[PDB]
Enzyme design. Sequence first.
Site, PDB file in Angstrom:
ATOM      1  N   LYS A 255      -5.608  12.320   3.930  1.00  0.00           N
ATOM      2  CA  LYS A 255      -5.464  11.280   2.917  1.00  0.00           C
ATOM      3  C   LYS A 255      -5.290  11.950   1.563  1.00  0.00           C
ATOM      4  O   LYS A 255      -6.120  12.777   1.166  1.00  0.00           O
ATOM      5  CB  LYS A 255      -6.703  10.372   2.899  1.00  0.00           C
ATOM      6  N   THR A 256      -4.231  11.576   0.836  1.00  0.00           N
ATOM      7  CA  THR A 256      -4.053  12.016  -0.541  1.00  0.00           C
ATOM      8  C   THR A 256      -4.869  11.144  -1.500  1.00  0.00           C
ATOM      9  O   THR A 256      -5.193   9.990  -1.223  1.00  0.00           O
ATOM     10  CB  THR A 256      -2.577  11.916  -0.942  1.00  0.00           C
ATOM     11  N   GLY A 257      -5.132  11.698  -2.676  1.00  0.00           N
ATOM     12  CA  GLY A 257      -5.610  10.899  -3.788  1.00  0.00           C
ATOM     13  C   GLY A 257      -5.040  11.473  -5.062  1.00  0.00           C
ATOM     14  O   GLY A 257      -4.895  12.694  -5.183  1.00  0.00           O
TER      15      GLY A 257
ATOM     16  N   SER B  82      -7.674   7.749  -4.196  1.00  0.00           N
ATOM     17  CA  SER B  82      -7.428   7.093  -2.925  1.00  0.00           C
ATOM     18  C   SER B  82      -8.014   7.828  -1.737  1.00  0.00           C
ATOM     19  O   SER B  82      -7.943   7.261  -0.635  1.00  0.00           O
ATOM     20  CB  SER B  82      -5.941   6.821  -2.696  1.00  0.00           C
TER      21      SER B  82
END
EC number: 3.5.2.6
Length: 237
Positions: free
Chosen positions: A184-186, A46
Amino acid sequence: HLNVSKMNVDDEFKDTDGTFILHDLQKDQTFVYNRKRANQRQTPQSTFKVVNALIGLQVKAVRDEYDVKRWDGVKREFESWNRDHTLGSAMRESAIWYYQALARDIGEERMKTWLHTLSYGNEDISGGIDQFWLQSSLTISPLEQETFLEKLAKEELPFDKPVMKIVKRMMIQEEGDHYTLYGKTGTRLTDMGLGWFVGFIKTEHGSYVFVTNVDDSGTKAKNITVDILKKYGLITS
Ligand SMILES: [Ca+2]
Ligand SMILES: [Ca+2]
């Protein structure tokens, strides 16, 4: 007055295989922990939502951070996904289905052109227009993510200025009196075995770009990052 070249983050990676990059924009200096892993292309998960939102707004496939897509009523794994979403809320909650609809509206030819213009990793979308960032064909190294995010921080990418302002606002994670954390995490959500947290921190003295990548979840990547940013006096109050 932090000199990033003198940092050490070994302890913050306790029990984790990962890499960390911190770029001080004002001094133009970069710290790297685990350079070998920093150079290894990995699937973006993501974290790709940052790019997808920029392109989607630029090409007018979505209007702004409040562009509503109604939930189809399909019960997905996380209750936070099971509601109407906007471009901004689907970023905050990593609601993949919203960004899959966006990617389909961008379409493969336009997406491919944009990833080449942006030099985004291996640029490979052959895994499919709504799958390619999800443990699939597209890969990008942590250092390549940092290069991209520095251009976003400096507003040097080939996007309209208001588009970049909207996406930056959408990334805000926490605001103090003295700092703003953007990120932003992924996660590879199948096995929780690959994680990212990428973004920027703005302080009163300047901004820093960071990339954290680990053999663990995106939540773990974010927690490691926050630990480092507190340790080095960038997250204060
Ligand atoms: Ca520590
Ligand atoms: Ca471990």
